[PDB]
């Protein structure tokens, strides 16, 4: 956030809480809009042997 | 009828069935032609009593294994269609139908192929599978497709390209082929692979490990 400290004090007094601690606008703590690629694990039926479909 | 089966027919008649029987164990009567080839000092063919032990047959008529009997690695007792057996079994097994059935291989055509500790055991089985791939008539699905599939898998096994989880996979492929084909060529293609996997799995696994090591 970014505002005058006297306005922050007035806000805290009127609301009764420290507003700055839990700001409702996301300034910079959220995840990046670009991420590394994933890998994604395969399922339990991805076996090469002992996997006849009639048993599952 | 097989040529050998017919040729003996008149001698059995003249001498009698009782005489012919007087040779070999029960249900294993008569004499037999054996072709001893591979890693033996004197490869040949010889007539012998049915239930002769394998070791006596190899060391007497064929001159033994090159490098001594302790140089022996494996023996295919009845031609390529029968599963191979290791030296642990070869030293005490009899050369008849029931005895070799109890050794999980089978007498086959009584064509002993000997391989010593100096051969690539996977390469020999791969060559046999290539023979079966080239000899399939192609009529039925399990043979026509699965024998070619097994040939490709085995050629990759020879190099070590595969992973251990494929070995069991290969086993199941053979099981699907065996007993599901019109002809018994599918059985003869699936049995050598089963023998190699049953008796020489660690060699396959270490070949895969080596290939991974120098390839990463
Ligand atoms: C009489 C009271 C007027 C005081 C006032 O207008 O500003 C109070 C100003 C507001 O602070 P804040 O906006 O809460 O703090 C963060 C800033 O906005 C963050 O600052 P900023 O970067 O947004 O600044 C932009 C700048 C420029 O913005 C503008 O151009 C707005 C002008 C439009 C007004 C006409 O703001 C101004 O200079 C305009 C202020 C008043 C103009 C009217 O703080 C004070 O100086 C105290 C005022 C009295 C408190 C009660
Ligand atoms: C793929 C294949 C090839 C065979 N080739 C021969 C062969 O070359 N000679 C032979 O006597 N039997 C061969 N057989 C087995 C025959 O079925 C067998 O000769 C026939 O049943 C009669 O043989 P027998 O006199 O021993 O009873 C072959 C079987 C298969 C499945
Ligand atoms: S199993 Fe026999 S009939 Fe079937 S494709 Fe092979 S050779 Fe032909």
* Helix (H) or strand (E) run with residue B37 in it: strand B31-38
Please give the Cα distance from B39 to B105 (Å, whole number).
20
Cα A41 to ligand 2 centroid, rounded to whole Å: 51
Please give the Cα distance from B17 to B102 (Å, whole number).
27
Give residue B13's region: left, alpha or beta (phi > 0; psi -120 to 50). alpha
**Cβ neighbours for A37, distance < 8 A, ≥ 6 positions apart:** none
Please give the Cα distance from A17 to A22 (Å, whole number).
10
On the CB side of B38, CA atoms within 13 Å amount to 27
Beta bridge partners of B35: B45, B111
* Ligand 3 pocket test target in B137, B141, B148, B149 with most atoms within 8 Å of CB: B137
The residue behind tokens 């006849």 is A52
Please give the Cα distance from B24 to A28 (Å, whole number).
91
Strands ordered across the beta sheet of B85-86: B44-49, B31-38, B111-116, B72-76, B85-86
Q: Go through B134-167 and write b for each residue having 16 or more CB atoms within 10 A of its CB, e for each that does not.
A: eebeeebebbbebbbebbebbbbbbebebeeebb
Distance of CA B102 to the CA centre of its chain: 14
CA nearest B167 in A: which residue? A49
B146 within 8 A of B188, measured Cβ to Cβ: no
Substitution target from B153, B172, B197 for chain A, most A beta carbons within 10 A: B172
Q: DSSP label at B42?
A: S
Write phi, then psi, for B96 (nearest 5 degrees). -135, 180
Angle at B183 between CA B177 and CA B185, to 5 degrees: 65
**Cβ-Cβ contacts under 8 Å, B165 against chain A:** 47-49
Instruction: Give the resolution to one decimal, in Å.
Output: 2.4
Q: The tokens of A55 are what?
A: 């048993």
Beta-strand relationship, B72-76 and B111-116? antiparallel
Q: Where are the beta strands (DSSP E) in A1-56?
A: none
Distance of CA B213 to the CA centre of its chain: 32
Please give the Cα distance from B172 to B69 (Å, whole number).
34
Please give the Cα distance from B115 to B90 (Å, whole number).
12
Cα B60 to ligand 3 centroid, rounded to whole Å: 38
Beta-strand relationship, B44-49 and B72-76? unpaired
Please give the Cα distance from B195 to B10 (Å, whole number).
38
The total of other beta-carbon atoms located within 10 Å of residue B122's CB is 18
Instruction: Specify the 3-state DSSP secondary structure of B191.
Output: helix
Please give the Cα distance from A37 to A47 (Å, whole number).
25
Which residue, among B8, B114, B125, has the nearest Cα to B61 in the 3D structure? B114
Distance of CA B94 to the CA centre of its chain: 15
Please give the Cα distance from A1 to A12 (Å, whole number).
14
Instruction: Specify the 3-state DSSP secondary structure of B44.
Output: strand
Q: Is B92 flagged in the annotation as binding? A: no
B164 within 8 A of B185, measured Cβ to Cβ: no
B175 within 8 A of B190, measured Cβ to Cβ: yes
Please give the Cα distance from B108 to B133 (Å, whole number).
20
Please give the Cα distance from B109 to B34 (Å, whole number).
8
Distance of CA B166 to the CA centre of its chain: 22
Write phi, then psi, for B104 (nearest 5 degrees). 70, 25
Q: Is the dihedral of CA B32, B33, B37, B41 positive or negative?
A: positive
B72 within 8 A of B54, measured Cβ to Cβ: no
* B7 in contact with ligand 2, CB cutoff 6 A: no
Beta bridge partners of B77: B79
Please give the Cα distance from B33 to B106 (Å, whole number).
16
Write phi, then psi, for B44 (nearest 5 degrees). -165, -175
Beta bridge partners of B32: B48
């Amino acid at each position: 956030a970014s505002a005058t400290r006297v306005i922050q004090l007035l806000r805290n007094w009127a609301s009764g809480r420290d507003l700055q601690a839990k700001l409702q606008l996301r300034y910079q703590e959220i995840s990046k809009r670009t991420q590394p690629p994933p890998k994604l694990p395969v399922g339990p039926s991805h076996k090469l042997s002992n996997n006849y479909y009639c048993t599952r | 009828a097989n040529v050998e089966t017919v040729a003996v027919s008149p001698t059995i008649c003249r001498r009698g069935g009782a005489w012919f029987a007087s040779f070999g164990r029960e249900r294993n009567s008569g004499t037999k032609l054996f072709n001893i080839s591979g890693h033996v000092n004197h490869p040949c063919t010889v007539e012998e009593e049915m239930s002769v032990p394998l070791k006596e047959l190899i060391e007497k008529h064929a001159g033994g294994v090159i490098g001594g009997w302790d140089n022996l690695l494996a023996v295919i007792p009845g031609g390529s269609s029968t599963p191979l057996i290791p030296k642990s079994v070869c030293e005490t097994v009899l050369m008849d139908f029931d005895a070799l059935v109890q050794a999980q291989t089978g007498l086959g055509t009584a064509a002993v192929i000997v391989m010593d500790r100096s051969t690539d055991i996977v390469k020999a089985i791969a060559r046999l599978i290539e023979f079966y791939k080239h000899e399939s008539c192609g009529q039925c699905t399990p043979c026509r497709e699965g024998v070619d599939w097994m040939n490709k898998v085995m050629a990759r096994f020879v190099k070590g390209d595969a992973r251990p989880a494929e070995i069991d996979s290969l086993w199941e492929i053979s099981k699907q082929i065996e007993g599901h084909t019109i002809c018994a060529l599918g059985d003869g293609a699936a049995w050598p692979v089963q023998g190699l996997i049953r008796h020489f799995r660690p060699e396959l696994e270490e070949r895969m490990q080596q290939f991974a090591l120098q390839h990463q």
